[PDB]
Amino acid sequence: PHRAELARQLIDARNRTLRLVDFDDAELRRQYDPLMSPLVWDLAHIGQQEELWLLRGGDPRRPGLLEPAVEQLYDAFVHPRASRVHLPLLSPAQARRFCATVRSAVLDALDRLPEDADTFAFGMVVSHEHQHDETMLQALNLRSGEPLLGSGTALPPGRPGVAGTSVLVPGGPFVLGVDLADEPYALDNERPAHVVDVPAFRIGRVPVTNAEWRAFIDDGGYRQRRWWSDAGWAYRCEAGLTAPQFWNPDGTRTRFGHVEDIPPDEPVQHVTYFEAEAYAAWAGARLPTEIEWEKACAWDPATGRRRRYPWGDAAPTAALANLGGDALRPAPVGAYPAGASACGAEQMLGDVWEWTSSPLRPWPGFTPMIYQRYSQPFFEGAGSGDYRVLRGGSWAVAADILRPSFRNWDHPIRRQIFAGVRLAWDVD
Ligand SMILES: N[C@@H](CCC(=O)N[C@@H](CS)C(=O)O)C(=O)O
Ligand SMILES: CN(C)[C@@H](Cc1c[nH]cn1)C(=O)O
Ligand SMILES: [Ca+2]
Ligand SMILES: [Cl-]
Ligand SMILES: [Cl-]
Ligand SMILES: [Cl-]
Ligand SMILES: [Cl-]
Ligand SMILES: [Cl-]
Ligand SMILES: [Cl-]
Ligand SMILES: [Cl-]
Ligand SMILES: [Mg+2]
Ligand SMILES: [Mg+2]
Ligand SMILES: [Mg+2]
Ligand SMILES: [Mg+2]
Ligand SMILES: [Mg+2]
Ligand SMILES: [Mn+2]
């Protein structure tokens, strides 16, 4: 909002990016997994997108620092993830230089903007950079070899009495989504604020834990097709799923290259949508819709009002939620009692992205932002395949870019993302 605050947010995002690529050139060029770009791709792409949206008015016909053919190497629509390791990409030195030149021009542009000028694009780019920072963390977690990152900063302890339990979300109208007047940098798929009727339902007080997931494995959950959808079972069989990713046969897990015991009370992480819906069915429950999820997060039934965050309007802090990337893991369930929503659901923001049963769809009145292909190509039926929405952010998401209305999405077969499960139930 204040130009100084935007500059601070862009600088904070770039600091984060540069820490994540502060390794030798050969590391940045490696393909850690065919699902993921080499880190050097995301680095140059971050700069190219910043240039496009802030210096070139989102018009690719306007000249950029790079030749158009070079610039198009960083267009995700043209280049599948797996192919990017073989593309003739900018070197790390070239990419850093390019990023720095763009940033210098962007900070100058910010200083020159007329009073009361619109600054939406600047906040959109802050969001874009942080989201690629989480993508790069996914890649670093997939990397085979001795750890490049540490084990993460301290988190609060969990507490007993929350795991497995649910809270009631009384039925009726609520306001879904937000307007720019409320949230000046809400992305296009979050808008507009509008009323929806949501029947009474219950939602998990905390996410499903590792120890709870182990019970699903031990009971033969991955060997019993009745819990799975037709597509989910087919995929389970094709991919040979038998446990969350990174769980090892000896009962340990590998997290950013660190082999460690699986903590029993941590939210389960790195499971597919198909695994999530199967666990839910086996447990006597289901997945929430994203609309149910957002009502549980943001609505205060005592006041008939939306809250800015589940806890109220206070900016996120380390006492309220696990965000920002430093922990490199979710916190034990029950670790954030003060971060509870009005209905009592805890850890809705931060820790793990939570699968929902909803495909990405526009709210009525949707209109695209300057980056018109950010949401639209991935709407249900738009021709890009199947997606399911995830909510709430993970331990890796910057507080600056997260809201109850924020919408992530991915193919249901993906689990290298930092994703877990929160249950829901019908109420008769
Ligand atoms: N989530 C999709 C990938 C979506 C995607 O391509 N995102 C661009 C955004 S620039 C990227 O390559 O990072 C998948 O895993 O298949
Ligand atoms: C929201 N998320 C799925 C997008 C965000 C993004 C980054 N660049 C373009 N879109 C993605 O990772 O592809
Ligand atoms: Ca969450
Ligand atoms: Cl792109
Ligand atoms: Cl660390
Ligand atoms: Cl509020
Ligand atoms: Cl980080
Ligand atoms: Cl489609
Ligand atoms: Cl898919
Ligand atoms: Cl149900
Ligand atoms: Mg800030
Ligand atoms: Mg206990
Ligand atoms: Mg209650
Ligand atoms: Mg309003
Ligand atoms: Mg038993
Ligand atoms: Mn991008």
Swiss-Prot record:
Molecular function (Gene Ontology), one example: iron ion binding
Keywords carried by this UniProt record: Iron, Metal-binding, Monooxygenase, Oxidoreductase
Coiled coil: none
A UniProt-annotated Pfam family: FGE-sulfatase
Binding site residues for Fe cation: H45, H128, H132
Membrane spanning stretches: none
Reported cofactor(s): Fe(2+)
Catalytic activity: gamma-L-glutamyl-L-cysteine + hercynine + O2 = gamma-L-glutamyl-hercynylcysteine S-oxide + H2O
Enzyme Commission identifier(s): 1.14.99.50
Presence of the UniProt keyword Iron in the record: yes
Domain of life assignment: Bacteria
Pathway: Amino-acid biosynthesis; ergothioneine biosynthesis
Keyword Disulfide bond in record: no
Binding-site residues, gamma-L-glutamyl-L-cysteine: R81, A82, S83, R84, D410, R414
Disulfide bonds: none
Family in the record: Belongs to the EgtB family.
PANTHER family noted in UniProt: HERCYNINE OXYGENASE (PTHR23150:SF36), SULFATASE MODIFYING FACTOR 1, 2 (PTHR23150)
NCBIfam families found in the cross-reference section: egtB_TIGR03440
Function: Catalyzes the oxidative sulfurization of hercynine (N-alpha,N-alpha,N-alpha-trimethyl-L-histidine) into hercynyl-gamma-L-glutamyl-L-cysteine sulfoxide, a step in the biosynthesis pathway of ergothioneine.
Quaternary organization: Monomer.
Protein's name in the database: Hercynine oxygenase
Gene assigned in the entry: egtB
